[PDB]
Amino acid sequence: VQLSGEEKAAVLALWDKVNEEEVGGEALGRLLVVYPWTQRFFDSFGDLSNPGAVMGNPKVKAHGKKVLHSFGEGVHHLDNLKGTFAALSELHCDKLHVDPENFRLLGNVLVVVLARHFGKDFTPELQASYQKVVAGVANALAHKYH
Amino acid sequence: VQLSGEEKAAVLALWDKVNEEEVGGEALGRLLVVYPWTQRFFDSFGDLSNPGAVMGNPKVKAHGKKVLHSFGEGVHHLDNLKGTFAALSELHCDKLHVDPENFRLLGNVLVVVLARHFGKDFTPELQASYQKVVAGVANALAHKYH
Amino acid sequence: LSAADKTNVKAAWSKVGGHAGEYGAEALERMFLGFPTTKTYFPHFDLSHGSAQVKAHGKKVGDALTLAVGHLDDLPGALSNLSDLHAHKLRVDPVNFKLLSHCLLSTLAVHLPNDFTPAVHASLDKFLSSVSTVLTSKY
Amino acid sequence: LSAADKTNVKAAWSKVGGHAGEYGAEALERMFLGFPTTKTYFPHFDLSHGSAQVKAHGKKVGDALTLAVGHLDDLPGALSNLSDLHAHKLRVDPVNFKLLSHCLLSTLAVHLPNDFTPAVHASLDKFLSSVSTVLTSKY
Ligand code: HEM
Ligand code: HEM
Ligand code: HEM
Ligand code: HEM
């Protein structure tokens, strides 16, 4: 990913402050509420009818934590994104059949959730760097669809 | 691009029958008529107000021929798409600032124009292979946006 | 849609005539082969070439499009039943409506090459986007 | 938009209050930095941080959003002037309306974290998509 050396340091320093469970649970829940067709993939998780049931569903929280942990792996391996997510790309293409447009949607919801948690510390410049990161991850996850 | 050996041969055999000037002129013209915000990039070419002025504009025909010729280069280099279009990706990102969603739009218009020219010979299976080709080209052209 | 679009769409669909079901089936087939992710909505279908389920479903799709062309001034009313089905029950990802639209245009180009002029393509594209918007309107 | 959406959007915008112009300017800045292709529509602007042109344009954007929230039942009428500008004169690529919407939501999250609940985010997303649709409706 085209990221300067000052940019990477700011990205890594913010990740130190990311609670993967809180952020991850909130980002996956907001995806399910805002883009409700994504609920189709998670029928396993039970009741996802109203926002209250989504945000407090323990499986939404646990899965969001797993998603965010894997995001954090990408953040710590920005020079090898395609290889970090190769196995996950196969899983999402071949087993789950997620359209890759949804990877971009989740990445943008994550950015909005980072904004909500960090406030004015989440500057326009730091958002810009995170937009490059989430796009890099979405394209690594789409690699094996191609 | 994930293409079988039988698939590549069918793709190449159709390209033998492609008139780059006729197909290219029609595909670029249809892009400009159907997705009229794309006209913004081609003010150089003059009058693009109504469909009649677009389809008969000689610069639309000449540019569409150039675009299709470069497509044909991709078709003949399907194992090295990123390298065939590297210089063009730089040009479209850095100099012209074309959003890459428009590469996908042009690729789909090209497929519709192939369908119109070849009729029943443009089978569901041959279209499927061309969809892989045009997506591979659109992603090679988007390479240096990332 | 503009009044010129409406006129083009009604004109173009009168040339489709009774082949709407056959074109709807071919469009589905083109979509399943070109865009294999779409097959996951049809676990209960035989997706074989010439499958009678695809042929029957293509007829339902073509009939709904013909109904829409007769109700261009009130698509949400004419299609409300289908909006609930695709958004609430089926939860179809909106991206797939773009894919089917493209496959339908490809099918019309194949069979009506002299009628599929640039102006008619542009009006049909707008019609199919307008149908798609209605069908994804319940989310 | 549903009636529940309308209620959420009117409620959420009353919490924005008089900061609509400042949020519109910040959203533009976030967009120009995150999505540099959008800068090509503003050759005549100083895109510096704190530029008065961006601040002034952010005020026009925030005012138009406030106008839209007062006219949720007739957005095409209330925004028709802006539809002609963005589609016919400026020819803004529709993708850029998604980018600005995302940047505006990001800005609201920053400044109103306790009010930016999942239900309010979902209603604002629908509102911004509905505004965007109107503004790209003339093609
Ligand atoms: C874009 C960033 C994404 C990342 C980093 C990511 C990551 C992951 C990870 C790490 C797993 C764990 C699989 C395992 O434990 O073996 C997983 C599974 C899964 N993901 Fe994703 N994912 C992303 C996007 C999406 C999206 C957008 C959807 C659907 C809208 C989705 C649907 C699923 C499903 C259904 C599973 C399996 C859940 C289960 O086994 O119960 N993912 N993903
Ligand atoms: C997706 C497949 C595409 C291919 C293979 C392609 C290819 C080309 C080629 C070969 C050139 C020649 C530049 C030169 O002669 O040095 C070019 C220039 C150009 N392209 Fe593309 N292009 C694609 C898509 C697009 C799209 C979608 C747009 C805008 C909507 C666009 C806008 C332009 C412009 C404005 C120029 C410069 C024209 C001029 O110098 O007068 N291209 N492109
Ligand atoms: C122009 C766009 C579309 C139209 C006019 C349309 C129309 C219809 C109609 C008329 C029905 C059957 C209603 C009934 O028998 O009760 C139906 C069902 C269905 N549609 Fe759509 N459809 C469209 C797009 C899509 C897309 C893009 C998908 C998914 C890729 C999809 C998936 C389904 C499925 C799974 C069913 C149920 C089929 C069954 O269970 O027999 N549809 N649609
Ligand atoms: C919520 C979406 C948007 C709204 C409410 C909005 C609103 C406005 C308003 C109120 C004006 C000024 C009208 C006037 O002074 O006559 C304007 C102008 C303009 N907008 Fe938009 N806009 C939106 C999206 C966009 C986007 C996405 C772009 C391009 C990336 C864009 C580019 C422009 C430009 C270039 C101008 C002319 C500015 C000038 O020359 O001073 N707008 N918009």
Side-chain angles (χ1 to χ4, degrees), chain A residues 1 3-81 83-103 105-119 121-146, chain B residues 1 3-81 83-103 105-119 121-146, chain C residues 1-125 127-139, chain D residues 1-125 127-139:
Chain A
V1 153
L3 218 53
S4 98
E6 228 97 75
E7 271 187 291
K8 284 173 66 290
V11 164
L12 301 182
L14 185 73
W15 207 259
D16 277 349
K17 310 196 225 320
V18 173
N19 182 331
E20 290 184 351
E21 183 176 84
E22 253 171 48
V23 170
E26 182 180 341
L28 184 64
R30 286 176 186 262
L31 181 84
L32 296 170
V33 167
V34 177
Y35 305 107
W37 60 89
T38 59
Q39 296 172 17
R40 171 182 185 265
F41 295 93
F42 296 99
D43 282 348
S44 154
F45 289 16
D47 188 18
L48 303 176
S49 10
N50 52 98
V54 170
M55 305 303 300
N57 182 296
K59 275 185 171 69
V60 168
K61 303 197 45 56
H63 190 69
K65 183 200 188 312
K66 296 192 320 254
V67 170
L68 259 273
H69 191 77
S70 148
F71 255 106
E73 278 288 297
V75 163
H76 288 123
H77 290 82
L78 289 165
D79 300 334
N80 184 24
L81 283 182
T84 294
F85 292 98
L88 276 171
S89 184
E90 170 192 286
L91 174 78
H92 290 81
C93 177
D94 293 309
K95 225 168 281 295
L96 320 164
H97 311 280
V98 176
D99 186 283
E101 183 62 23
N102 295 300
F103 306 148
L105 286 190
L106 179 51
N108 281 349
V109 172
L110 173 53
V111 167
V112 168
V113 166
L114 290 177
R116 208 187 60 80
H117 282 247
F118 291 100
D121 290 329
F122 196 72
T123 64
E125 302 75 11
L126 189 50
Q127 176 164 350
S129 302
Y130 267 95
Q131 296 293 163
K132 288 154 151 199
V133 172
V134 295
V137 163
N139 293 321
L141 275 169
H143 189 37
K144 302 244 171 133
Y145 284 72
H146 309 145
Chain B
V1 153
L3 218 53
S4 98
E6 228 97 75
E7 271 187 291
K8 284 173 66 290
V11 164
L12 301 182
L14 185 73
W15 207 259
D16 277 349
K17 310 196 225 320
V18 173
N19 182 331
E20 290 184 351
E21 183 176 84
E22 253 171 48
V23 170
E26 182 180 341
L28 184 64
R30 286 176 186 262
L31 181 84
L32 296 170
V33 167
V34 177
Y35 305 107
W37 60 89
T38 59
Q39 296 172 17
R40 171 182 185 265
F41 295 93
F42 296 99
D43 282 348
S44 154
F45 289 16
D47 188 18
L48 303 176
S49 10
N50 52 98
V54 170
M55 305 303 300
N57 182 296
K59 275 185 171 69
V60 168
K61 303 197 45 56
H63 190 69
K65 183 200 188 312
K66 296 192 320 254
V67 170
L68 259 273
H69 191 77
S70 148
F71 255 106
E73 278 288 297
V75 163
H76 288 123
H77 290 82
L78 289 165
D79 300 334
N80 184 24
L81 283 182
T84 294
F85 292 98
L88 276 171
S89 184
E90 170 192 286
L91 174 78
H92 290 81
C93 177
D94 293 309
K95 225 168 281 295
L96 320 164
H97 311 280
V98 176
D99 186 283
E101 183 62 23
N102 295 300
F103 306 148
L105 286 190
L106 179 51
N108 281 349
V109 172
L110 173 53
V111 167
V112 168
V113 166
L114 290 177
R116 208 187 60 80
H117 282 247
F118 291 100
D121 290 329
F122 196 72
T123 64
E125 302 75 11
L126 189 50
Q127 176 164 350
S129 302
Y130 267 95
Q131 296 293 163
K132 288 154 151 199
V133 172
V134 295
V137 163
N139 293 321
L141 275 169
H143 189 37
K144 302 244 171 133
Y145 284 72
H146 309 145
Chain C
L1 289 212
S2 91
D5 288 322
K6 294 172 30 143
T7 297
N8 289 352
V9 163
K10 289 182 174 115
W13 211 253
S14 79
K15 278 125 183 167
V16 168
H19 299 267
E22 303 156 46
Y23 295 167
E26 175 172 345
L28 291 164
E29 179 166 3
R30 286 179 187 275
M31 180 183 67
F32 294 136
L33 291 174
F35 305 104
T37 55
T38 62
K39 291 198 282 189
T40 70
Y41 292 91
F42 298 89
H44 53 300
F45 277 31
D46 176 32
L47 303 171
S48 149
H49 174 48
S51 151
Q53 271 170 299
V54 172
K55 171 172 137 102
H57 189 64
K59 192 69 245 190
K60 296 198 213 137
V61 174
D63 285 349
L65 291 177
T66 299
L67 174 90
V69 170
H71 293 88
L72 287 175
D73 297 299
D74 182 39
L75 288 173
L79 298 183
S80 54
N81 48 330
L82 291 172
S83 282
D84 297 312
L85 176 66
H86 288 82
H88 286 209
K89 194 201 151 104
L90 298 176
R91 282 163 323 169
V92 179
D93 187 328
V95 77
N96 297 315
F97 292 86
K98 286 182 209 313
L99 303 184
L100 177 57
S101 291
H102 167 65
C103 289
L104 255 169
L105 293 177
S106 288
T107 299
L108 296 178
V110 163
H111 293 281
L112 295 179
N114 298 308
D115 302 297
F116 196 78
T117 58
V120 163
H121 176 181
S123 300
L124 289 166
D125 178 72
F127 164 66
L128 297 177
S129 284
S130 291
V131 169
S132 292
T133 293
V134 173
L135 286 187
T136 64
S137 69
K138 286 340 172 203
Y139 46 52
Chain D
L1 289 212
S2 91
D5 288 322
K6 294 172 30 143
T7 297
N8 289 352
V9 163
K10 289 182 174 115
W13 211 253
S14 79
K15 278 125 183 167
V16 168
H19 299 267
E22 303 156 46
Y23 295 167
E26 175 172 345
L28 291 164
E29 179 166 3
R30 286 179 187 275
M31 180 183 67
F32 294 136
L33 291 174
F35 305 104
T37 55
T38 62
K39 291 198 282 189
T40 70
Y41 292 91
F42 298 89
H44 53 300
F45 277 31
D46 176 32
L47 303 171
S48 149
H49 174 48
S51 151
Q53 271 170 299
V54 172
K55 171 172 137 102
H57 189 64
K59 192 69 245 190
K60 296 198 213 137
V61 174
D63 285 349
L65 291 177
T66 299
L67 174 90
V69 170
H71 293 88
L72 287 175
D73 297 299
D74 182 39
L75 288 173
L79 298 183
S80 54
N81 48 330
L82 291 172
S83 282
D84 297 312
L85 176 66
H86 288 82
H88 286 209
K89 194 201 151 104
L90 298 176
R91 282 163 323 169
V92 179
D93 187 328
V95 77
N96 297 315
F97 292 86
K98 286 182 209 313
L99 303 184
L100 177 57
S101 291
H102 167 65
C103 289
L104 255 169
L105 293 177
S106 288
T107 299
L108 296 178
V110 163
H111 293 281
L112 295 179
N114 298 308
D115 302 297
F116 196 78
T117 58
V120 163
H121 176 181
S123 300
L124 289 166
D125 178 72
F127 164 66
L128 297 177
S129 284
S130 291
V131 169
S132 292
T133 293
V134 173
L135 286 187
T136 64
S137 69
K138 286 340 172 203
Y139 46 52

